Design a protein around this ligand. Structure first.
Ligand SMILES: OCc1cc(Br)ccn1
Ligand SMILES: OCc1cc(Br)ccn1
Ligand SMILES: OCc1cc(Br)ccn1
Ligand SMILES: OCc1cc(Br)ccn1
Ligand SMILES: OCc1cc(Br)ccn1
Ligand SMILES: OCc1cc(Br)ccn1
Ligand SMILES: OCc1cc(Br)ccn1
Lengths: 298, 262
């Protein structure tokens, strides 16, 4: 629409997605730096991929400071280019390259606060993200962090229907998905932010399982094996098995020892078994953990 | 009730209300279509209903496809010979957006009896995408209905199924239904289903949520009540056949009420 590839100057590759490569480019008329996600259709036999149709349609309508902006979509000849705003790095690269002595608590607190704002905006616009992980969270030089990669995202209805199973990168996947539940909702995105919260503190994933059952087991060893009291219905869930080992819930202060009381409170509510009890992004913004929050720079 | 998003249902409803006004087709685009008519559109929609039941597609997918078609026909003149190609690409787009397991393109070609080619379906897919500017996350009658259903005291499956049938019946007849918003047809449908099954009326709780009263719904409700009375006679019968099935509690077999007391 408002643009053609004549006006972009490629700068360097910055990444790779399921359907192509991402470049950093420069608008030669305005100066603006962007990310071009190329999607090829010439080498597509089922027309425009469903991932791109969702990514584009859903991002069009999510205008918010903590959701990366789709600036444009260009259909050249046999090709489809998504123009996105440019951010310098993702959260995973930052915890790995500049958080050796750690991420300072103000910056964790600022980032989690912004993530919750973005996700609340998603959920208020009937959109599940379904792949929140540090790789998919983009940071700028001004202290902003933004949800990105909406390729697995989905417009939901109220109430929710059965959607695609086995969504969410495994380390970030909620128990209700692992147990094969008929329905999942906005709480699966909170579970992911919960894992991410912990990961920002430690710089290591909280539950790095190598299979569905190993993931469950790791969750259960940390938070205790759930039962009917903590999670009504759990024992009747499709992939629940009675033979599941029954691990005791360890004291939460031992799960992320550097975390203060408010942090632990918030984290515990993000990682509640029961999706009904699990805190929403909207309610989380008011949690005392954020009482003193600011927006400092990377 | 996290499956019913208690913390977000209002935000969502408000947003869908905003989006239905922005995604609305032009009432009476058919007058400005030289070569096609409401009656042709009715044939296409009825076909899309059968395609959906054959491939066991969601109701939402049907609703979206009709939405795409109506909006597309609002800016593009289409010869009668190409009307089915448009509908086919609409159904493919809606299926890729809403279906866990969409049919393959080759299956969309197959259902058109090789009237069109794989190349034609795909080029039209691109055209519809361009004309709609990828604005595909459109509110449907169905999205409103499912929220209205949360206000039943208590839930009744015959009520739910009858509402979806009536809302579906509306999709066939651009005249009059193009003049109503999805949220209003869903309200009329829900009240009529409720009145028919249980004798009850549009709840006060839905007055609170929507702002609509039986007064604001009356015009649409008079039309829907006729559509319902006359449905055994309509030229298009695919929805009635579909709603004979147990999956939908056989609701098309229920007798419509003779009067509304409205
Ligand atoms: O300019 C045309 C366009 C822009 C966006 Br953002 C999405 C789809 N189409
Ligand atoms: O001219 C084609 C093109 C491709 C990329 Br990626 C960036 C700019 N221009
Ligand atoms: O890796 C995909 C991507 C990167 C940036 Br920077 C912006 C949008 N999408
Ligand atoms: O793959 C190992 C495993 C163990 C149990 Br108990 C249940 C399912 N799978
Ligand atoms: O009744 C005329 C007609 C309708 C359709 Br749909 C396709 C071809 N001809
Ligand atoms: O392939 C079945 C069919 C669809 C339409 Br639209 C018109 C006639 N026949
Ligand atoms: O397809 C969009 C639509 C259809 C009807 Br019938 C009424 C309002 N909007």
């Amino acid at each position: 629409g408002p643009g053609s590839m004549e006006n972009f100057q490629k700068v360097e590759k910055i990444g790779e997605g399921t359907y192509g490569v991402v470049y950093k480019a420069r608008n030669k008329l305005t100066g603006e730096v962007v990310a071009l996600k190329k999607i090829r259709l010439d080498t597509e036999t089922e027309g425009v991929p469903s991932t791109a149709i969702r990514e584009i349609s859903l991002l069009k309508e999510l205008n918010h400071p903590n959701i990366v902006k789709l600036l444009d979509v260009i259909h050249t000849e046999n090709k489809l280019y998504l123009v996105f705003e440019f951010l310098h790095q993702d959260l995973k690269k930052f915890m790995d390259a500049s958080a050796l002595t750690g991420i300072p608590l103000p910056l964790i607190k600022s980032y989690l606060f912004q993530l919750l704002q973005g996700l609340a905006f998603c959920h208020s616009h009937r959109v599940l993200h379904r792949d929140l992980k540090p790789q998919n969270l983009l940071i700028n030089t001004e202290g902003a962090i933004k949800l990105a990669d909406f390729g697995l995202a989905r417009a939901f209805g109220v109430p929710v229907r059965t959607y695609t199973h086995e969504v969410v990168t495994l380390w970030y996947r909620a128990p209700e998905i692992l147990l094969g539940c008929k329905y999942y909702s906005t709480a699966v995105d909170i579970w992911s932010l919960g894992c991410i919260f912990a990961e920002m503190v430690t710089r290591r994933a909280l539950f790095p399982g190598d299979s569905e059952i190993d993931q469950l087991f790791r969750i259960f060893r940390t938070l205790g094996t759930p039962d009917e009291v903590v999670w009504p219905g759990v024992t009747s869930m499709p992939d629940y098995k009675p033979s599941f080992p029954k691990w005791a819930r360890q004291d939460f202060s031992k799960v992320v020892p550097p975390l203060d009381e408010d942090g632990r409170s918030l984290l515990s509510q993000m990682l509640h078994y029961d999706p009904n009890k699990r805190i929403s992004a909207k309610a989380a913004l008011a949690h005392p953990f954020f009482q003193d929050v600011t927006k400092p720079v990377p | 009730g996290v499956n019913e998003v208690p913390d977000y249902h209002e935000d969502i409803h408000t947003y869908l209300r905003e989006m239905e006004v922005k995604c609305k087709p032009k009432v009476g685009y058919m007058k400005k279509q030289p070569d096609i008519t409401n009656s042709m559109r009715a044939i296409l929609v009825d076909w899309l209903v059968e395609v959906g039941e054959e491939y066991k597609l969601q109701n939402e997918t049907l609703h979206l496809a009709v939405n795409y078609i109506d909006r597309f026909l609002s800016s593009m003149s289409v010869l009668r010979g190409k009307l089915q190609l448009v509908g086919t690409a609409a159904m493919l787009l809606a299926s890729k957006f809403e279906e866990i397991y969409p049919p393959e393109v080759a299956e969309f070609v197959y259902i058109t009896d090789d009237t069109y080619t794989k190349k034609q379906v795909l080029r039209m897919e691109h055209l519809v995408l361009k004309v709609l500017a990828f604005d595909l996350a459109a509110p449907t009658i169905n999205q409103f209905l499912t929220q209205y259903f949360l206000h039943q005291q208590p839930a009744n499956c015959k009520v739910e199924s009858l509402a979806m049938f009536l809302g579906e019946l509306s999709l066939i007849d651009a005249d009059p239904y193009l003049k109503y918003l999805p949220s209003v047809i869903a309200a009329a449908a829900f009240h009529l289903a409720l009145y028919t099954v249980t004798g009850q009326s549009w709840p006060e709780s839905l007055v609170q949520k929507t702002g609509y009263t039986l007064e604001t719904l009356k015009p649409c409700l008079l039309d829907l009540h006729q559509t319902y009375l006359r449905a055994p006679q309509h030229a298009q019968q695919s929805i009635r056949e579909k709603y004979k099935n147990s999956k939908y509690h056989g609701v098309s077999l229920l007798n419509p009420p003779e009067t509304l007391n409205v």
